[PDB]
Write a protein that binds this DNA or RNA. Structure first.
Ligand code: MG
Ligand code: MG
Ligand code: MG
Ligand code: MG
Ligand code: MG
Ligand code: MG
Ligand code: MG
Ligand code: MG
Ligand code: MG
Ligand code: MG
Ligand code: MG
Ligand code: MG
Ligand code: MG
Ligand code: MG
Ligand code: MG
Ligand code: MG
Ligand code: MG
Ligand code: MG
Ligand code: MG
Ligand code: MG
Ligand code: MG
Ligand code: MG
Ligand code: MG
Ligand code: MG
Ligand code: MG
Lengths: 102, 210, 147, 53, 203
RNA sequence: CAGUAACGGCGAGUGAACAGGGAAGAGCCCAGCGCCGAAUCCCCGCCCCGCGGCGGGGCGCGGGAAAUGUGGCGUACGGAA
RNA sequence: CCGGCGCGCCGGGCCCGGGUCUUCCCGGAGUCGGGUUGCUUGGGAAUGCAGCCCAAAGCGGGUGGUAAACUCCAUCUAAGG
RNA sequence: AAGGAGUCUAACACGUGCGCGAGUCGGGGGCUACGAAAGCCGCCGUGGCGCAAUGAAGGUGAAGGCCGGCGGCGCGCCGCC
RNA sequence: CUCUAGUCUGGCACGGUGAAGAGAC
């Protein structure tokens, strides 16, 4: 078959050789280090928990996950941040169980 | 009141436009001032080129201009690293550098590397001490023939590859260009819904086995 | 040249070309496009049909550069290359066909309107229309797509 | 901000230069400008290059 | 380093320790005057991040401003005009309370220069900010080439010309499609160029 | 670009930005994170010089600032050992 | 008369780099963001600014000009100068 | 007696004169007393307008006829070289 | 007709320390 480069379609565009470079160092940001993770959870046992997430853990303990998601969404804003907060706020709930189980 | 036939015009003269009127009676005065400043700068950098540092080979985005080529702001760090030029020394010998640029392609990268090599071959470098020559610099016979360049350094010119009149083959006579354009447009438009319908067809028919 | 204007011939005439009964008052019908619905409706409908109302979809961040597609018809296809490109293929005997790159001349889509001279072509274009490719195939030729 | 300046097409400026130059090699047209050229030997009056010195 | 711990410590303002400290400090600053000198920065890591260096000539002033919107200063009702401009109660000031606090510090201390400011507490009726001030005529600032830019007469009353961070946030400047209306020097600079008719010689 | 996309009793009217061609073109520094004996800064007394934009070196078991953090390396283009 | 452009000398500083591996380290919080209110913008289910309330995260966050969920991409690194 | 009232700028329409002509235009920039003028640039024609329209939009985008051979329909038609 | 000072009323925040009791799912 005779194929040609096209400006439309599923594989449109001029054809070049994509070289591979090192990833840009501005893109690194947001990654945890072993030291800042230690600092943040160190501040976590020193401080404790906020009053709204203390209520949300009580909501997640009785397995009302949808109401816990809606409460966290109304309290902090967006659905993505609500899901990310609920996942860590249930992982700490599971961590408190395996510490007191044995 | 409108006349018989004409345009509906909307003149934007409802504010106090007469206060902010910019007249151009100092245009031939600013042209002389810019020319005198340009010549004073050209005399200040006496063997250095009057345009400044060399600008790289750069493609234009935004499909109206993607066939043209242009002078960019600076050579990228990948280009300088392949060419073997340190980024804090390149600005001292008239190489324009910006660190924001990326290199998605290979052909433009190697074109700018060749651009750096050909400028490095043309660079006539004076010793830092005029009374005593150094290692990586030009000899005394080139410094006395060293002049000042006028215009941009290595000017950027759009080249087109000339092609022979070729004998048309039978498979080039069978290529349907408009049919290929229409079917490629349809296959780009209908790609997601075809995959979702195939997923539903594979999901409804796997319920039969279980 | 104010000496050629109508004002110099209107000195001595009292109303200055503007009428004794209906004077040259300031704005006797409103300012600008006033009363397009009400008292200039007959002019606005007899000369500007369609001026009031909403038609079609909105597009918020429209940039004109995305839909840039300049067109050339096939009656201008042979003007993009030189004359000695055209006459050498006419005097040519091996059947080699010259290549016309319309993207180099600054055109994206080739439409087919006029005639083509009876000689083979290889037209490289970003887009083609159907009658444009059939008029090239009928004279005997290639329609090469480029991106 | 009155329009003081006018722009003229380059081809018309050159055309007027050609028309003014071609009229300077004619007898009656330079006489009718009033120039006293009754004893001038040739109307395209061309001299040698040491005049610049 | 301890500064990273204090920084992550101040991000947990809903914790018991920080709600105790913020409440007792807000009570303490509520008993003082509306503007007074702090002997040292209350929040040292954040003062350090904003540009405070603990050396001679760097001054910290603590200041409180009243909260709420901006009532229009007009007699009883009676803001005379069309119904668009009858609004008096629910109007809002275009500049932040931190920017008000910076200029209230900088006007009372006119011999110094405002560098930055930070929040240290609030309640229903007051917000408390601490302002970093630099003496431009102390020799520790004059002879340090890193911080001798502030001594220049260009930087007189940055907090009044909106060149600090807090007053800078209210001008709507920045790079992008969201800040088209301040292309140029500022919002008024964009307006001048867009509403200036360019009348050329040859048109 | 453009009186355009858009806003507007979608009426009167208002109304940018990107790409492109030029004028000019120059880039950088902290905090943090770390390592160096605070390795840093200011003032007063004396000696000589400069001295009309108050500076330079030498002394002072002289005084302070600063460990609730000054200076050197180092900043997102990565950096340090 | 003033200043620039230079040379020699004295008294000082500064005691310096590049490349390939290996081991480490890396970020600005009542701030982002969400709701609501008012002004503003061409910005239209909210362009920008501000008051009040809520209030973060770290394969994170912002942007991707129609609100929302899922999934990929692309592009920067805000709240210091 | 003196002064005293359809002006100037922008936009549009139509007519008229000039130049070039499917092109045309340097207005912005640059080069080189009157002269702040004039001249020049063409890989400075970017860009504007014209050379293509239509649809809300995805999009599409400006004569055909005869003959021979082949295939199908039941002498004509369709498709195919 | 369309708004507005002031005023009445509800919610959130400043805004805590305990005792009882009545509650809905
Ligand atoms: Mg009339
Ligand atoms: Mg009459
Ligand atoms: Mg009259
Ligand atoms: Mg009349
Ligand atoms: Mg009338
Ligand atoms: Mg009448
Ligand atoms: Mg009138
Ligand atoms: Mg009526
Ligand atoms: Mg109004
Ligand atoms: Mg136009
Ligand atoms: Mg209406
Ligand atoms: Mg407006
Ligand atoms: Mg641009
Ligand atoms: Mg340039
Ligand atoms: Mg340090
Ligand atoms: Mg940066
Ligand atoms: Mg903000
Ligand atoms: Mg207002
Ligand atoms: Mg408005
Ligand atoms: Mg997306
Ligand atoms: Mg969308
Ligand atoms: Mg910054
Ligand atoms: Mg910045
Ligand atoms: Mg008179
Ligand atoms: Mg005409």
């Amino acid at each position: 078959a005779l194929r040609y480069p096209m400006a439309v379609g599923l594989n449109k565009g001029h054809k070049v050789t994509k070289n591979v470079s090192k990833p840009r160092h501005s893109r690194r940001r947001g990654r945890l280090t072993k030291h800042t993770k230690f600092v943040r959870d160190m501040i976590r046992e020193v401080c404790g928990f906020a009053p709204y997430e203390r209520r949300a853990m009580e909501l997640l303990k009785v397995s009302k996950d949808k109401r816990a998601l809606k409460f966290i969404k109304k309290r902090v804003g967006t659905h993505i941040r609500a899901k990310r907060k609920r996942e860590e706020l249930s992982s700490v709930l599971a961590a408190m169980r395996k510490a007191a189980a044995k | 009141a409108p006349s018989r036939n004409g345009m509906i015009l909307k003149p934007h003269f409802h504010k106090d436009w007469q206060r902010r009127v910019a007249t151009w009676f100092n245009q031939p005065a600013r042209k002389i001032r810019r020319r005198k400043a340009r010549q004073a700068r050209a005399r200040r950098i006496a063997p250095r080129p009057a345009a400044g540092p060399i600008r790289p080979i750069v493609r234009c985005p935004t499909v109206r201009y993607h066939t043209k080529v242009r002078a960019g702001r600076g050579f990228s760090l990948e280009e300088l690293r392949v060419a073997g030029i340190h980024k804090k020394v390149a600005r001292t010998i008239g190489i324009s550098v910006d660190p924001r640029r990326r290199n998605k392609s290979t052909e433009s990268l190697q074109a700018n590397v060749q651009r750096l090599k050909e400028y490095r071959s043309k660079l006539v470098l004076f010793p830092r001490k005029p009374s005593a020559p150094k290692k990586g610099d030009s000899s005394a016979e080139e410094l006395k023939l060293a002049t000042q360049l006028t215009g941009p350094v290595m000017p950027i010119r759009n080249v087109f590859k000339k092609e022979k009149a070729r004998v048309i083959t039978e498979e080039e006579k069978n290529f349907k260009a408009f049919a290929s354009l229409r079917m490629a447009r349809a296959n780009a438009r209908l790609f997601g819904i075809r995959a979702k319908r195939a997923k539903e067809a594979a999901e409804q028919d796997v319920e039969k086995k279980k | 040249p104010s000496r050629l204007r109508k004002t110099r011939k209107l000195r001595g005439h009292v109303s200055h070309g503007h009428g004794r009964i209906g004077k040259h008052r300031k704005h006797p019908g409103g300012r600008g496009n006033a009363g397009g619905m009400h008292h200039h409706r007959i002019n606005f409908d007899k000369y500007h049909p369609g001026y009031f109302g909403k038609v079609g979809m909105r597009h918020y961040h429209l940039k004109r550069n995305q839909s840039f597609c300049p067109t050339v018809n096939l009656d201008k296809l042979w003007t993009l290359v030189s004359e000695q490109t055209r006459v050498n293929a006419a005097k040519n005997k091996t059947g080699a066909a010259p290549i016309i790159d319309v993207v180099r001349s600054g055109y994206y889509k080739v439409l087919g309107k006029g005639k083509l001279p009876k000689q083979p072509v290889i037209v490289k274009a970003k887009f083609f229309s159907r009658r444009a490719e059939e008029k090239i195939k009928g004279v005997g030729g290639a329609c090469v797509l480029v991106a | 901000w009155r329009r003081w300046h006018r722009r003229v097409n380059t081809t018309q400026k050159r055309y007027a230069i050609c028309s003014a130059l071609a009229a300077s090699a004619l007898p009656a047209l330079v006489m009718s400008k009033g120039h006293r050229i009754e004893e001038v030997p040739e109307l395209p009056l061309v001299v040698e290059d040491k005049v610049e010195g | 380093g301890a500064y990273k711990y204090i920084q992550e410590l101040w991000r947990k303002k809903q914790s018991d320790v920080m709600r105790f400290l913020l409440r007792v400090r807000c009570w303490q600053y509520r008993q003082l005057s509306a503007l007074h000198r702090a002997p040292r920065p209350t929040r040292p890591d954040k003062a350090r991040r904003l540009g405070y260096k603990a050396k001679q000539g760097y001054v910290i002033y603590r200041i409180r401003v009243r909260r709420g919107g901006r009532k229009r200063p007009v007699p009883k009702g009676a803001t005379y005009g069309k119904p668009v401009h009858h609004g008096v109660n629910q109007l809002k000031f275009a500049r932040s309370l931190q920017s008000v606090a910076e200029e209230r510090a900088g006007r009372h201390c006119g011999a110094l220069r405002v560098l930055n400011s930070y929040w240290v507490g609030e309640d229903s009726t007051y917000k408390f900010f601490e302002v970093i001030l630099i003496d431009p005529f102390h020799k520790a600032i004059r002879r340090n080439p890193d911080t001798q830019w502030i001594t220049k007469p260009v930087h007189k009353h940055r907090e009044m010309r909106g060149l600090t961070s807090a007053g800078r946030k209210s001008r709507g400047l920045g790079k992008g499609h969201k800040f088209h209306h301040t292309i140029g020097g500022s919002r008024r600079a964009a307006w001048r160029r867009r509403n200036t008719l360019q009348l050329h010689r040859y048109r």
